[PDB]
Amino acid sequence: GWGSFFKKAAHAGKHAGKAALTHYL
């Protein structure tokens, strides 16, 4: 991990926002 610290929770809405950033291809 490095894209974001734990703080609240891991895999927050960003590195794995049900699409990761904005991927879907």
From Swiss-Prot:
This is Pleurocidin. Antimicrobial peptide with potent activity against Gram-positive and Gram-negative bacteria. Activity against E.coli and B.subtilis. Weaker activity against L.mucor, s.marcescens and P.aeruginosa. May play a role in innate host defense. One of its GO terms (cellular component) is extracellular region. Disulfide bonds: none annotated. Goblet cells. GO terms for biological process: defense response to bacterium. The chain holds residues 23 to 47 of 68 of the full protein. It is found in: Secreted; Membrane. Keywords: Antibiotic, Antimicrobial, Lipid-binding, Membrane, Secreted, Signal. The peptide is disordered in aqueous solution. Its main location: secreted. Belongs to the pleurocidin family. GO terms for molecular function: lipid binding. The keyword Cytoplasm does not apply.
